[PDB]
């Protein structure tokens, strides 16, 4: 979307005082802080071709997107109990462990 934050997400808009959207950019900040970390679908369809999906690879694709869900991933997600899996994925794992794993997925692509 943008690089900064001054003015807020929606400037001049009323806000109330979905949590995935915040943790997504948190993992993004961590990945940014690991610096050494048409070729889109070539790398993207490479990330999911072996058919052994994991939540780390989903995260690794957005670090190509914010930087298909139906026609490939949707069945795996509903077999995971919905997005209760991805938020639980950040849960039973270190901030650092999750970040290092997702970096690995990008390193090998």
């Amino acid at each position: 979307d943008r690089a900064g934050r001054m003015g807020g997400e929606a400037p001049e808009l009323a806000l109330d005082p979905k949590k995935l959207s915040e943790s997504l950019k948190r993992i993004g900040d961590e990945l940014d802080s690991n610096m050494e970390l048409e070729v889109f679908f070539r790398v993207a369809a490479d990330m999911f071709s072996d058919g052994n999906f994991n939540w780390g690879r989903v995260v690794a694709l957005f670090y190509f997107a914010s930087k298909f869900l139906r026609e490939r991933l949707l069945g795996w997600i509903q077999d995971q109990g919905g997005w209760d899996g991805l938020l639980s994925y950040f849960g039973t794992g270190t901030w650092q462990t999750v970040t290092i794993f997702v970096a690995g997925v990008l390193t090998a692509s």
């Epitope: 979307d1 943008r2 690089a3 900064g4 001054m6 003015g7 807020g8 400037p11 001049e12 806000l15």
Partner: antibody, heavy 118, light 107 residues
């Protein structure tokens, strides 16, 4: 050293337009939002808008929707502000300013004084 | 947009004085309030960001505090080079500057 170097025409007739440039150097241009600021007496300091050079996304202060157009070229690491349909009220100093990472308006252009007159 | 009321508009002080400038927001802006210093012919200079953080190279006699609606910039011991105009800036929702405080030397 981060440097923001501005250039633009300083004397324009009412009703014409003007293009202000802001050449960035010393950092990766597409990693930071660039904002634009107006300063003139009576009216004070005003935020015009920002552009993110990473994708050309912009956001404008309502008061400046239509008066100002912000663009960025990654290749020349330069941001631009076009101001159209100038009147005397647009006589001001215009700044480009970089928004930092974990910090705000640390580096500024030197400013461009725009004078609208016949 | 959020309104910034900055006061006083004009402040007289001597070298060695502790100076404070106030800024009031018309609604809560959290910690997202900065202070800038400007000399004639120059762009503003960041002095304090996010209520109380010091940028690199800014002398430690500058500090800030705030509640989210009421904010202060303090200079612990004024120096000659601190004579200038000072502006607050909220950036929680949109961006709004205060109208400025001109700081002069007393004699």
């Amino acid at each position: 050293q981060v440097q923001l170097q501005q250039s633009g025409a300083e004397l324009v007739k009412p009703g014409s337009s003007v293009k202000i440039s802001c050449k960035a150097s010393g950092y990766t241009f597409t990693n930071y939002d660039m904002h634009w600021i107006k300063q003139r007496p009576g009216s004070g300091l005003e935020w015009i808008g920002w552009i993110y050079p990473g994708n050309g996304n912009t956001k404008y202060n309502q008061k400046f929707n239509g008066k100002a157009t912000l663009t960025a070229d990654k290749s020349s690491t330069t941001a631009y502000m076009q101001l159209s349909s100038l009147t005397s009220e647009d006589s001001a100093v215009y700044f480009c300013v970089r928004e930092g990472l974990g910090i705000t308006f640390e580096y500024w252009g030197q400013g461009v004084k725009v004078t609208v007159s016949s | 947009d959020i309104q910034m009321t900055q006061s006083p508009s004009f402040l007289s002080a001597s070298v060695g004085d502790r100076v404070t400038i106030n800024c009031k927001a018309s609604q809560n802006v959290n910690k997202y309030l900065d202070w800038y210093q400007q000399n004639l012919g120059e762009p503003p200079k960041l002095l304090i960001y996010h209520t109380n953080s010091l940028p690199t190279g800014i002398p430690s006699r500058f500090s800030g505090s705030g509640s989210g609606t009421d904010f202060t910039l303090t200079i612990s011991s004024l120096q000659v080079e601190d004579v200038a105009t000072y502006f607050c800036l909220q950036h929680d929702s949109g961006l709004t500057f205060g109208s400025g405080t001109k700081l002069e030397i007393k004699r």
